[PDB]
Design an enzyme around this catalytic site. Structure first.
Site, PDB file in Angstrom:
ATOM      1  CG  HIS C 236      -1.803   1.234   1.293  1.00 55.01           C
ATOM      2  ND1 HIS C 236      -3.153   1.211   1.011  1.00 55.01           N
ATOM      3  CD2 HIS C 236      -1.511   2.513   1.629  1.00 55.01           C
ATOM      4  CE1 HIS C 236      -3.657   2.421   1.172  1.00 55.01           C
ATOM      5  NE2 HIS C 236      -2.680   3.232   1.544  1.00 55.01           N
ATOM      6  CD  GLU C 240      -0.960   7.191  -2.823  1.00 57.61           C
ATOM      7  OE1 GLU C 240      -0.515   8.185  -3.444  1.00 57.61           O
ATOM      8  OE2 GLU C 240      -2.001   6.566  -3.162  1.00 57.61           O
ATOM      9  CE  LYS C 243      -1.639   5.001  -6.234  1.00 53.16           C
ATOM     10  NZ  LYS C 243      -3.018   5.235  -5.732  1.00 53.16           N
ATOM     11  CG  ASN C 244       2.250  10.420  -4.400  1.00 58.18           C
ATOM     12  OD1 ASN C 244       1.177  10.110  -4.907  1.00 58.18           O
ATOM     13  ND2 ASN C 244       2.404  10.588  -3.090  1.00 58.18           N
TER      14      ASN C 244
HETATM   15  N1  LIG Z   1       7.168  12.381  -5.249  1.00 55.75           N
HETATM   16  C1  LIG Z   1       6.492  13.554  -5.315  1.00 55.75           C
HETATM   17  N2  LIG Z   1       6.926  14.584  -6.084  1.00 55.75           N
HETATM   18  C2  LIG Z   1       6.266  15.755  -6.172  1.00 55.75           C
HETATM   19  N3  LIG Z   1       5.123  15.999  -5.505  1.00 55.75           N
HETATM   20  C3  LIG Z   1       4.578  15.055  -4.690  1.00 55.75           C
HETATM   21  C4  LIG Z   1       5.247  13.752  -4.549  1.00 55.75           C
HETATM   22  N4  LIG Z   1       4.506  13.021  -3.703  1.00 55.75           N
HETATM   23  C5  LIG Z   1       3.446  13.780  -3.328  1.00 55.75           C
HETATM   24  N5  LIG Z   1       3.490  14.992  -3.915  1.00 55.75           N
HETATM   25  C6  LIG Z   1       2.504  16.088  -3.750  1.00 55.75           C
HETATM   26  O1  LIG Z   1       1.655  15.851  -2.618  1.00 55.75           O
HETATM   27  C7  LIG Z   1       0.284  15.871  -3.001  1.00 55.75           C
HETATM   28  C8  LIG Z   1      -0.485  14.853  -2.174  1.00 55.75           C
HETATM   29  O2  LIG Z   1      -0.084  13.545  -2.583  1.00 55.75           O
HETATM   30  P1  LIG Z   1      -0.976  12.278  -2.171  1.00 55.75           P
HETATM   31  O3  LIG Z   1      -1.351  12.400  -0.706  1.00 55.75           O
HETATM   32  O4  LIG Z   1      -0.312  11.026  -2.678  1.00 55.75           O
HETATM   33  O5  LIG Z   1      -2.331  12.539  -3.007  1.00 55.75           O
HETATM   34  P2  LIG Z   1      -2.393  12.672  -4.608  1.00 55.75           P
HETATM   35  O6  LIG Z   1      -1.127  12.099  -5.201  1.00 55.75           O
HETATM   36  O7  LIG Z   1      -2.717  14.119  -4.894  1.00 55.75           O
HETATM   37  N6  LIG Z   1      -3.745  11.680  -5.084  1.00 55.75           N
HETATM   38  P3  LIG Z   1      -4.147  10.285  -4.109  1.00 55.75           P
HETATM   39  O8  LIG Z   1      -2.823   9.630  -3.807  1.00 55.75           O
HETATM   40  O9  LIG Z   1      -5.033   9.466  -5.015  1.00 55.75           O
HETATM   41  O10 LIG Z   1      -4.807  10.785  -2.848  1.00 55.75           O
HETATM   42  C9  LIG Z   1       0.309  15.523  -4.477  1.00 55.75           C
HETATM   43  O11 LIG Z   1      -0.852  16.023  -5.146  1.00 55.75           O
HETATM   44  C10 LIG Z   1       1.612  16.124  -4.971  1.00 55.75           C
HETATM   45  O12 LIG Z   1       1.475  17.497  -5.358  1.00 55.75           O
HETATM   46 MG   LIG Z   2      -1.102  10.100  -4.422  1.00 55.17          MG
END
Ligand SMILES: Nc1ncnc2c1ncn2[C@@H]1O[C@H](COP(=O)(O)OP(=O)(O)NP(=O)(O)O)[C@@H](O)[C@H]1O
Ligand SMILES: [Mg+2]
Ligand SMILES: Nc1ncnc2c1ncn2[C@@H]1O[C@H](COP(=O)(O)OP(=O)(O)NP(=O)(O)O)[C@@H](O)[C@H]1O
Ligand SMILES: [K+]
Ligand SMILES: [K+]
Ligand SMILES: [Mg+2]
Lengths: 383, 87, 381, 87
Positions: C236, C240, C243-244
């Site tokens: 998990h 997650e 994906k980011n």
């Molecule tokens: N590796 C990364 N590089 C750049 N920005 C990041 C990264 N990881 C997270 N972020 C930022 O943090 C925000 C929140 O991430 P996250 O909590 O994973 O939700 P999400 O990616 O927007 N969608 P979800 O994971 O489906 O809830 C993202 O929308 C990105 O802008």
């Molecule tokens: Mg995410």
């Protein structure tokens, strides 16, 4: 007058300190840096900064306050307050009043020159008696970051005045505005700090890791990374980190000879300037990272004392940055200095005495927020 | 039970401060005031200071609204009465 | 009785939940795990965990409580409590009582399947009205890390029981002891998580970066890195994070068949198992990092919701680990998962409701102990 | 006359717990006890729990020492007097 000292403290501690941007410092030391406005400002602000923090010195446990070392700096602050206070009603536009003001600041700086090791000795003196105490730990910790940050800012303000006005004529940097370099070569400061640490490393181990340097300017692909900073603050941070990484690399290569380099990454964005120092020195378990920034943990009963880390962090926190560590036990560690890219965003981070600060002192021992596991867990194994 | 109330005048939050902008009222009309709480946010040109309650009681009326610029020293800002029977 | 629910809360809320190590889970499902002790334990422990958190639900502002969704899950937690309590005075050693117990756990697990999107819906429906105030915001954040971590633990206990004591004919694996893999190939979980993520990315962007893995084992130079863990939890988190990383990598190169790979570094020492995920996806400014673990920030008014980061960190924290983010704006980002290397150290991270927990909801707006600068700083020139 | 004292009997901190170990005392003899304070650490075979005070007073005497293993429920642990006049 020494007798009235407690009411001067009560007067100026009521006031709130005035944080400055690096833009403000720089723009002031323009061309006609007005000594009259620097004197009248400082004549007021320094006592404000002194009184605020002295109010907090008086709020730490009596077991700490009683120690000779603490009181030795307490006596330094009391004098500094007064030496400055004898200027409050003095007349500007008189060169005598201005000239002897900078002399007074020079003396204050010479007086306060050993504040860091001395406050550290008082905590050591506290550690050589009552030992450890959870609530006492918190209060000393809360106090030290503030005390030391208050100090850096006082040093800042003093150095600005002295370096600009005629406590110089030959020995300085005839390009800096005070201690501030408007076009500071981040890379050159990295190389400088490396050179010294390496030197100390070779003269204490006879072996040393190399330096690898990389830059990523995302604001201008080709441009060498420069910023408006205090190179000495930057130097202090990297010199310290470098030493930690060098010790770790040499000490964790008991079988070695073939030392993995210390890698540096300088990134610049729209808002951040980030410097990553990476080492392959065996790392630290996570539960020990938090301890590394504790003043009461790294003290007993290249590696000198144990204040390099907490203090470097303060330097980074002073202009709204940070220094973070992340190791991987068994591999190595990454240390990261974060700095504001823009001089507008580079604003002084200053401790403030008030009801809010007061309550952070004298706090109670609380019940756990989360579950605390048993020391001898129930054996749930079968027959 | 007709008392002379407690008055809240703007103090020098900075030594050379002659006036201040009343930025943000953190207590609304008819709230409890314990000695020390955050009452409002006062901003000068040198700092943004959190103005704390000195005398215990209750807030009944506000003389200077949110966003009023350059309010001088000693200026009445709000009223404090010890009894909450004013709501 | 439904009418007597509030006293059932006060009774069980008074007790402390019981944190279990992974060693304990592993020793229970030793050879022949005993359904009796699992029954007599959960029969009591699950009320406790329910009651503790439920007492914290009724402490968040009325503005959040009044919303259909928060109140929908509240009513679930009420039911699951009463369902489990219907077993309190029941007789162990009677197979009927045990058999229908696991069935009740199945029912409760299905009832609670959609707790995460629903609690997120409530806070959204809360933001659709009152919006923002620091005193409410802080309490919600404090509540949600606790509420979600609690759920993971309740789902853990239910999943252990049912996997072990229900449906002997085979899904499952099951070299696993419930959902726990005693010899969990960290690398494989990474590859699997990457495969699913690269799939979603490769079809929502039609481009994805490669993967590179590297392992450093300090305990045993050669040996591949394994651990006692719940692959789901690990998967998990990694899924997650991938994906980011992929999104940001793809969205920052905005013109490339030359995408830089995501690098994985797995290290194992005496105490930590550490997984570092490096991407060159252009990074995030520091003032924005702390915001990425805020529940109220990543919700308005490949990348789906906004609860991916906060929740994955709770998985990492649940067995005394952590999930730390650090970037360099304009370069990339490192994300580190930290897990205890020893099943003895992997102990449950559970919220207890107590007087100490009570006062965290009962605070108000203070002045800062640090100087806030002026919004219009004096012209110094 | 007998001072209006409070008594601290050991409760079940786990619903099946009948006995527990007294880990260590976090409040020594003669200390004030505001409601909420961490009084002592109680360790069973399932959890270590922070035992909190419920009524205000002072620590007068310890009845069950530190490290004492398996103390049954309802057992008095210390005496609390509402008045300061015992030190
Ligand atoms: N590796 C990364 N590089 C750049 N920005 C990041 C990264 N990881 C997270 N972020 C930022 O943090 C925000 C929140 O991430 P996250 O909590 O994973 O939700 P999400 O990616 O927007 N969608 P979800 O994971 O489906 O809830 C993202 O929308 C990105 O802008
Ligand atoms: Mg995410
Ligand atoms: N890069 C690193 N790798 C491994 N361990 C480190 C690293 N940096 C710091 N440490 C640990 O953290 C402590 C360093 O804290 P620090 O404040 O730098 O004091 P010090 O280096 O011991 N001496 P000094 O800095 O000269 O006062 C040491 O005890 C090290 O064990
Ligand atoms: K002040
Ligand atoms: K409880
Ligand atoms: Mg050092």
């Amino acid at each position: 007058s020494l007798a009235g000292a407690p009411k001067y403290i009560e007067h100026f501690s009521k006031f709130s300190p005035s944080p400055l941007s690096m833009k403000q410092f720089l723009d002031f030391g323009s061309s006609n840096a007005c000594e009259k406005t620097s004197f009248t400002f400082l004549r007021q602000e320094l006592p404000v900064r002194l009184a605020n923090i002295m109010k907090e010195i008086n709020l730490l446990p009596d077991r700490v306050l009683s120690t000779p070392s603490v009181q030795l700096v307490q006596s330094w602050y009391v004098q500094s307050l007064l030496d400055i206070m004898e200027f409050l009603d003095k007349d500007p536009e008189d060169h005598r009043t201005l000239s002897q003001f900078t002399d007074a600041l020079v003396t204050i700086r010479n007086r306060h020159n050993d504040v860091v090791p001395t406050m550290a000795q008082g905590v050591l003196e506290y550690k050589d008696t009552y030992g450890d105490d959870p609530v006492s730990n918190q209060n000393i910790q809360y106090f030290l970051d503030r005390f030391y940050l208050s100090r850096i800012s006082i040093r800042m303000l003093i150095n600005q005045h002295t370096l600009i006005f005629d406590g110089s004529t030959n020995p300085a940097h005839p390009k800096h505005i005070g201690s501030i370099d408007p076009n500071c070569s981040v890379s050159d400061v990295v190389k400088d700090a490396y050179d010294m640490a390496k030197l100390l490393c070779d003269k204490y181990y006879m072996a040393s890791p190399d330096l690898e340097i990389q830059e990523v300017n995302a604001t201008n692909a080709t441009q060498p990374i420069h910023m408006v900073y205090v190179p000495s603050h930057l130097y202090h941070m990297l010199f310290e980190l470098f030493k930690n990484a060098m010790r770790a690399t040499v000490e964790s290569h008991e079988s070695s000879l073939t030392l993995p380099p210390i890698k540096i990454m300088v990134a610049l964005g729209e808002e951040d300037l980030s410097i990553k120092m990476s080492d392959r020195g065996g790392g630290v378990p996570l539960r020990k990272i938090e301890r590394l920034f504790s003043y009461m943990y790294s003290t007993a009963p290249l590696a000198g004392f144990g204040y390099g880390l907490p203090i470097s962090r303060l330097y980074a926190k002073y202009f709204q940055g940070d220094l973070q560590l992340f190791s991987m036990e068994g591999f190595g560690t990454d240390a990261v200095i974060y700095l504001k890219a823009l001089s507008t965003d580079s604003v002084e981070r200053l401790p403030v005495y008030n009801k809010s600060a007061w309550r952070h002192y004298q706090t109670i021992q609380e019940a756990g927020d989360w579950c605390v596991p048993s020391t001898e867990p129930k054996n749930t194994s079968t027959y | 039970s007709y008392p002379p109330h407690m008055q809240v005048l703007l103090p020098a939050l900075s030594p050379t401060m002659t006036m201040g902008t009343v930025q943000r009222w953190e207590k609304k009309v008819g709230e409890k005031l314990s000695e020390g709480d955050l009452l409002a946010e006062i901003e000068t040109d040198k700092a943004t200071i959190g103005f704390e309650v000195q005398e215990e009681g209750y807030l009944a009326k506000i003389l200077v609204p949110e966003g009023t610029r350059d309010v001088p020293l000693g200026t009445p800002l709000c009223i404090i009465v010890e009894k909450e029977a004013d709501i």
